[PDB]
Structures are given as C-alpha cells and as structure tokens.
C-alpha cells in the first residue's frame, strides 16, 4: 500500500491530482495488453487499476463486459494475469498497481493465498467489486497481512456509518463512486460529491479517487477541484482499445493522446 502513500505525498507536492486508467489484463491479448499498459504509464498514468478477466462481471457495463470477452477469446487465465503483473512490476518500481477483482476469483484457491500471490508479484491494492464492507472482513484482513491495501467503495448513497467504516478499514485510496449503476463512459455522474469528500477527510480516510463515467478532461479537473485526490477512467480507455482492434499502432497512439490529455487536466 506504501506506493499509494508515496504517490499521494508526491502529487501533493506537485499540486496535482492522480490520473488512474483501468484496463482488463490480456485485452485484446497478453502481448498487446503489456504494450497498452506501458503506453498508459509512459503517457502519464499515476497509478493503474487492472481487471482479471471473469466470467460474470456484474458491476461492469457493456464496454468492460466486452473487454473481458476479448481477453477470454485470447485464452487469458488468472494465472497468466499474475505472470503479467509480476512483469509489469519488474518494469515499473513505484507506480501503484491496483486490481479489480470479483469475489469468486479471490476465494477460489483460498483468500489468504490470493493476497499472498498479490504480494509476491508486487500488487498494491485489491478492490473486490461484489464484496460490500459488510462482508469485507476476511478480505481486508488477508489484504493487510500481505501489505495490500483493501479498496472500499464510498457510494453516493453513503450514510455516516458507511463513511466511518470505509475511512477506518480502507487503505491506499477510497473509491468515490460517481453514481449508481455499473461502469460505463456513456453515463456521467450527476451528483455533487464534495460533502462526501469532506467527511472522508474528517474521518482520516485514504485519499479519494472518483470513478465511474469519467471520460473527459473537465471531469478530471472537476474531481480535483471538489477535493478528490484524483480520478479513475476505465470505459473511456477500453473504448479506445475496442475502437482500434484492427490497428495496434494507432491504438497505442490514441491511448497516449487520451491519457496525456487526462493527466494534464489533473494539474490544479
């Protein structure tokens, strides 16, 4: 989790928000995915959120549903994903790497063993999309034993108990959900989140990253202006993959262009 603490301290010094892309590991294949991820970093990504392909991603809209399907079409397995993660860390020592998981992949071969593998490959955080704070205990315990930050969702429908729980249990960053629904660039969050941001700070929560429906620079700047430490973008990044399947080189160029613009918008 220490990579997040270091990043946030550095970004505070550069008076910048964090820009954090999401991609699915192995979409559209292992080799291209490794190139995609290196392009995101080179173009200014401050941290990564990385999905392991899962059969039933019930928190994801169609864009990311299709990314998982592409990775399965390429034969991508969790074991291959962990191989990828080891290599990504071997290339990039300081960038925080967070995984987006579904519970069954974590529970499958034992929760503790899952987090031990994350620690072995150099992952910094795990967000389990279908585990609410109410069910989180064995997950957050295993995470902390293995120096992994457990990432909690602060939904816009959050009450005071939830804010206090997420502030207490979370590390790394607090995921500030833009809105109800599922991932997708086609739906923009129509709710002011400043009050949640302030309460989380009051309760000494991990710094907040806003996510869901972030697809434009103005949204990155808006997140920072509201007091968030930064912003996560997934579907917008994955749509560039989907748009450019036929042209790997153009795919990387467009990814670079997009990430560069989005990172530039994080300057306060």
């Amino acid at each position: 989790m220490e990579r997040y603490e270091n990043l946030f301290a550095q970004l505070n010094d550069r008076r910048e928000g964090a820009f954090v892309p999401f991609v699915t590991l192995g979409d559209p294949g292992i080799e291209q995915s490794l190139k995609i991820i290196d392009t995101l970093i080179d173009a200014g990504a401050d941290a990564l959120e990385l999905g392991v392909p899962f059969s039933d991603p019930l928190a994801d809209g169609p864009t990311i549903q299709n990314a998982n399907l592409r990775a399965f079409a390429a034969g991508v397995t969790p074991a291959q994903c962990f191989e990828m993660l080891a290599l990504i860390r071997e290339k990039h020592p300081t960038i925080p790497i967070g995984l987006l998981m579904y519970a069954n992949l974590v529970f499958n071969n034992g929760i503790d063993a899952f987090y031990a593998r994350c620690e072995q490959v150099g992952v910094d955080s795990v967000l389990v999309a279908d585990v609410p704070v109410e069910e989180s205990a064995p997950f957050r315990q295993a995470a902390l034993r293995h120096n992994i930050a457990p990432i909690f969702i602060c939904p816009p429908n959050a009450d005071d108990d939830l804010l206090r729980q997420v502030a207490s249990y979370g590390r790394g960053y607090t995921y500030l959900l833009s809105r109800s629904g599922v991932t997708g660039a086609e739906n923009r969050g129509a709710l002011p989140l400043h009050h949640l941001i302030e309460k989380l700070k009051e309760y000494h929560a991990a710094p907040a990253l806003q996510g869901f429906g972030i697809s434009s620079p103005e949204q990155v700047s808006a997140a920072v202006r509201a007091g968030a430490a930064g912003a996560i973008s997934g579907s917008a990044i994955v749509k560039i993959i989907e748009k450019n399947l036929a042209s790997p080189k153009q795919m990387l160029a467009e990814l670079r262009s997009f990430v560069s613009a989005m990172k530039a918008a994080s300057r306060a």
Binding site: D56, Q65, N104, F107, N108, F152, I153, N157
Partner: protein, 394 residues
Amino acid sequence: TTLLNPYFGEFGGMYVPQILMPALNQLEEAFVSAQKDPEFQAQFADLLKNYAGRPTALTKCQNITAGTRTTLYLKREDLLHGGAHKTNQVLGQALLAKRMGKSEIIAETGAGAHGVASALASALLGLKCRIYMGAKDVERQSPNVFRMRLMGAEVIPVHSGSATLKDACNEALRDWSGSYETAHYMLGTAAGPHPYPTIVREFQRMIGEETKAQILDKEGRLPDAVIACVGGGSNAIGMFADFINDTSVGLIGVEPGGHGIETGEHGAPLKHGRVGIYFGMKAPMMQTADGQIEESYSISAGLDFPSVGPQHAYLNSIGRADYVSITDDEALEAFKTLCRHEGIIPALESSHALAHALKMMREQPEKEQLLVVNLSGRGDKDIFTVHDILKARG
C-alpha cells in the same frame, strides 16, 4: 447491519456491489414488516386463493406403486395458475414491490416459467415488468417469450457471457444497481443475496404447510419423506420448510445429473460442485478449476441455475436434508411412467423428483414408506422435447 441473519451456517450472505446494499436492506425491512402485517397477509392469501387457485390438490397415485409397500402422493403445484409453483412467491414479491412504493419489476428467467409468472403478476397488479433472459434461452423458449410479451412484459435478450440464465442474472443485477429507487428485482429462486433465500422460502412455504395438513387428513401421520427437484431451490424449500422441525420426516432434494455426474455434464453443484461466491451468495457452484462460473446441463430447462440456494447447502451440511441426483434418462422414464399410469403429464424438472421416488420404491419394494413428491410444474411445455427424444430413439 441487517434485521435477520444473512447466513445459513457458512452459506449465503450479501455479496453484491456496495451500491445495492441499501436496496437489500430496504427489501429486508419491507419483508419483516409485511410478515407482521395482517393486511398484507390477507391480500396475499386472496391472490393465492382466488387468482392462483390455492390450495392445490394432493393426489394419491395408486397405479404407479401397485405391488409395493410405497404409498406415493403428488403435491399438485402443476395445477397452480401459470402451471408451476413459481406463481406463489411472485405474488408475494409483487406485493412487497407495491409495499415499498416500487412501480417496476425486473426478473430473470431461464426456462421462462418464472418470467411468465412475473409477467402475469405484473399485469394483474399494474407493475411495469422487464425480464432478462439469456439469448440462447430466448431462442429455445419462443412460447414462453410470447406469453410474457402477450402479458405486456418487456423481454430483453442477454448476449453477454454464455447467453444463458447466469448471464440474465447478471443483467438483472446490473439494471437493479441503477434503478432500485423505482424498480424491484423479482428473483425467481431461493438463492441470491439475503434477503432473497429467506423471502422466497417464506412465500413458498404454503406448499409444505398444505402438504402436512393434507397428509394428516388422508393418512393420519406425517410422510416418511418429501422429495423435490432442486434447480435453485425454491420449490424444494417451499415443500421442506414446514417439515424441518419434524425430525422424523426425510427431506430429499434432487439435482439434475444430466448425462451422468462422471461426464461433468450435469447440474448438481450441491453434491458435485465446489463452494464459491457468486450471484450475491456463498454457495456450491458449477465452476472451472480457475474459478470461472459454468452452466448447469440438464434435459430440463428449469434445472439450469448453476448454483443452489444457501439454505439447501446448510441443511445438507448438518445432515437435516439429503441430496441426490437423477439423470436425463431417469427423468424421461419417470415422465413417461406418470403419463401412462396416472394420466398426469409432469414437468421434466418435477420428473427428476418423481424418478427418485420411483427408485426409492423399486430398490426396496417391501419397505413400507409414505412419500410425497412435489410436482412443481405441468409438462405440457416439455412434450416437444420428449417427442424429439423418443423420435430419435424408438
């Protein structure tokens, strides 16, 4: 924080995205409230009696057990409006939706029976109904899809994943995670996150309650066992619930064995799968070695839920209920037998329960045993499937 225990032992829980927790809590509260509300109970009873046709018959089947010491009754949920037990809990859930001020219904369906039941109840009670159904299932169940649409429901084919029931389940939950302020998710089995396993049991338990009263009237004693097929677990738990505390009464659940357990092509996760976490619960799953969710295979469309309700996994663990499997061929033989000897055409799902009762009788024909099979649905819908198999055979 919940009012009721979300777990049955180690099984169950509320494994949904955080965004959906208020909806589950709201539903739990509305249910706990409704169960104490005489007005709610009266409205539910009225619908079950005057619209659905409860109580259902308990039929003694004399011909099929002749020359053995088995007495077999069939609980006739095939005679309920809609032709399956699914109607019971749909009516209760539709009333909860109204209680909560919700005006829209989301439902998943595989075989289409729950979808039809959801559509009919929504039509009666003035709710706007949308049904998700895997694209493969839409293709296989043209009749049911048409029935749903005739009743004014929107049927939405789901093309993601394997385009079957689990994928419909996902889509329902994605929709709900964005619409819960106005829409209720009318889950179709005793599975999913709390409070659904509990709600579905309580809204199906009249099956077992009536069965107990009927068997006492006709036989003067409780059954030796009650036997029900297990897809997700609703008809079975509705039959079992009222007998759980009657420890003399065997509770036998029958999972589909498909082409045979050893083939891997089955739908028997309780006894032959592996515990996992999916569709909001910790429960036995059909899954790969890596933890990807797989489909249930059965000749019977309605035994396609690739997991099982958590209360069944719990009742198994403690040895209160026993679970077995019946293959496609066994189920088909039971189907033909009931048609020819009792003049009842059973659903192929239900035929799995009947097949296991016939095995109990045939294996030990001099054992005195009083058995009830829950006949969860009528088999009108299956005569094409059976036709095609018997054509490809004799």
